[PDB]
Amino acid sequence: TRIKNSRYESGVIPYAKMGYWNPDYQVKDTDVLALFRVTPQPGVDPIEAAAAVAGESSTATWTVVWTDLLTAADLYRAKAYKVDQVPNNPEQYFAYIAYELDLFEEGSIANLTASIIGNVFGFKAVKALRLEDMRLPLAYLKTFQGPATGVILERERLDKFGRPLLGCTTKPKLGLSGKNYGRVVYEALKGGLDFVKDDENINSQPFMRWRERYLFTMEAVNKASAATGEVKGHYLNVTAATMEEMYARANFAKELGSVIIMIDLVIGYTAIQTMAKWARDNDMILHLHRAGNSTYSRQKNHGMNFRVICKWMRMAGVDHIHAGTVVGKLEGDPIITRGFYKTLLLPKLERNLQEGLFFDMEWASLRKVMPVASGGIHAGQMHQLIHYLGEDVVLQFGGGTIGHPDGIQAGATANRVALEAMILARNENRDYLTEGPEILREAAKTCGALRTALDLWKDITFNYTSTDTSDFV
């Protein structure tokens, strides 16, 4: 007798008809925008698919519920407002969705992600789904901290400008003892590297508990500083099972004087945000290793594109983040990669279909995240590295240092000299990309360390077909 008869009378109706599809919607400067790469099941109308993604990631459900009336439903419902066919693919479409600001909890990556990537990726009606880019609004971006230290403050604390930084992940990955670990750290830092680091999987294990590594490593870092006159640092990994344990390692790092520490993306968003606040509160540089990322970022048909993670992580307040190399061993298209670097460094982003940046985006003055290039690179590629990656980046040579036949110090010097020669040439306005090999050759004439390096990995290359590629090239 009280049963309803209207839009809210019990029963199932298509999402496109529940208010989730509105091609006339005018985007508000306060809306959170998302761009998905939708692949609906055969037989499913893409508009209805986009609308299902818009519905299920905001306020809808598979059937009509009258409780909507008890809220400002017309405002809270997300709207799919645009659907374009993917350039050369009859099975994919780019769906633009707008979300009202009031839907999200201020400064929480977890809540942001809970809505955006909560259930939509498992919908049967949608054969494949991928989050390609997001437009975080100024007013929302202001509720976040942003990089704890930031590229500018970082360089000022390190007293190092106008040139990339150099680091090195200790090798072997696992297995080394504390005393020996520090040995490697001393040699590489004194040799010329700015940083040395624990591997993402180096925490606390039977072959080496963490406290010894911290002690010995700090002795190594200080000797190096005293042996070079530079502010040196080693990424002490505080990654652990619980927040209490992580705090225990970060605080010990703080007590011993470390300028920097590291964490793995695998700890999770909440732990990350917690650490980002800790770093801002404790004048520490916070390096983030993207462990596990490629698990959902590699393929072009499903998952999340790394540039979105770049936005979220810069918001969270992380100081460094492996954004990829272009000539290394890991996946990384040059143009898409330029996208990642811009997202982490620029104060404002501009739409660029080639780079995969679908939205213009102000950064509300949040500090800059320092990009890290690591995996498979070596001196000799320096011209390409500078050319693609630029000035603001940490060039990390793991085996590219320790592998040198004349010792760790030698490996490090080779990289440091290679790096400086190349940017001294850049500054001189030389076509260093072209003159590259010769520039290194001309520098190696004065440093045996470099000469050797240049011969060892002379033809070492990683040419393969990319998976994460542009659609407008």
Where in 346-385 is the site for another protein (CB under 8 A)?
346-347, 365, 368
**Is 197 known as a binding-site position?**
yes
> At which residue do the structure tokens 């520039």 appear?
439
**Is 290 known as a binding-site position?**
yes
Q: Least CB distance from residue 17 to another protein, whole Å?
A: 20
For residues 195 and 262, the answer to whether their CB atoms sit within 8 Å is no
Given a second copy, another protein, none, residue 352, with its beta carbon under 5 to 8 Å by kind, binds none
> At which residue do the structure tokens 């959170």 appear?
32
CA–CA dist 262, 239 (Å, integer): 7
CA–CA dist 471, 206 (Å, integer): 48
For residues 323 and 297, the answer to whether their CB atoms sit within 8 Å is no
According to CB under 8 A, which one of 82, 127, 157, 302 is a site residue for another protein?
157
The interface with another protein within residues 170-209 (CB under 8 A) comprises 175, 177, 179-180, 182-183, 186-187, 192, 207
The interface with another protein within residues 404-433 (CB under 8 A) comprises 407, 413, 416-417, 420-421, 423-424, 427-429
Rounded to 5°, the CA angle 335-338-342 comes to 145
According to CB under 8 A, which one of 23, 85, 89, 118 is a site residue for a second copy?
118
Nearer to another protein (CB atom), residue 313 or residue 450 = 450
Q: What backbone phi and psi angles, to 5 degrees, belong to 353?
A: -50, -30
The contact pattern for a second copy, residues 327-346, with x = CB under 8 A and - = no contact, is --xxxx--------------
CA–CA dist 49, 40 (Å, integer): 6
Nearer to a second copy (CB atom), residue 25 or residue 247 = 247
CA–CA dist 53, 18 (Å, integer): 12
17's CB contacts (< 8 A; 6+ apart) are: none
The interface with a second copy within residues 428-467 (CB under 8 A) comprises 456-457, 460, 462, 464-465, 467
| DSSP bridge pairs for 233 | 195
Given a second copy, another protein, none, residue 429, with its beta carbon under 5 to 8 Å by kind, binds another protein
Rounded to 5°, the CA angle 266-462-454 comes to 110
Given another protein, a second copy, none, residue 271, with its beta carbon under 5 to 8 Å by kind, binds a second copy
Of the residues 190, 287, 289, 300, which is catalytic?
289
Q: Least CB distance from residue 81 to another protein, whole Å?
A: 21
Buried residues in 421-435 as b, exposed as e (16+ CB within 10 A): bbbebbeeeeebeee
**Is 183 known as a binding-site position?**
no
The interface with a second copy within residues 253-312 (CB under 8 A) comprises 264, 266-274, 277, 280-281, 283, 289, 291-299, 301-304
For residues 7 and 116, the answer to whether their CB atoms sit within 8 Å is no
Where helices occur in 229-268 by DSSP H, the ranges are 243-255
For residues 70 and 9, the answer to whether their CB atoms sit within 8 Å is no
Nearer to a second copy (CB atom), residue 244 or residue 428 = 244
CA–CA dist 96, 323 (Å, integer): 25
**Is 404 part of the annotated catalytic residue set?**
no
Given a second copy, another protein, none, residue 256, with its beta carbon under 5 to 8 Å by kind, binds another protein
CA–CA dist 221, 308 (Å, integer): 35
The interface with another protein within residues 283-342 (CB under 8 A) comprises 283-284
Binding status of residue 227 toward another protein by CB under 8 A: yes
Of the residues 82, 127, 160, 171, which is catalytic?
171
Given a second copy, another protein, none, residue 89, with its beta carbon under 5 to 8 Å by kind, binds none
The interface with another protein within residues 21-80 (CB under 8 A) comprises 66, 69-73, 75
Binding status of residue 189 toward a second copy by CB under 8 A: no
Strand order in the sheet with 320-322: 165-167, 394-396, 370-374, 320-322, 285-289, 260-264, 233-237, 195-197
**Is 171 part of the annotated catalytic residue set?**
yes
Contact range with a second copy by CB under 8 A, out of 80-88, 110-118, 218-226, 380-388 = 110-118
Given a second copy, another protein, none, residue 163, with its beta carbon under 5 to 8 Å by kind, binds another protein
Rounded to the nearest 10°, the torsion over CA 50, 56, 57, 58 is 110
Strand order in the sheet with 93-99: 79-85, 93-99, 32-40, 126-135, 303-304
**Is 28 known as a binding-site position?**
no
Nearer to a second copy (CB atom), residue 141 or residue 417 = 141
- What amino acid positions are annotated as catalytic residues? 171, 289
> Residues at the annotated binding site for substrate?
119, 169, 173, 290, 322, 374
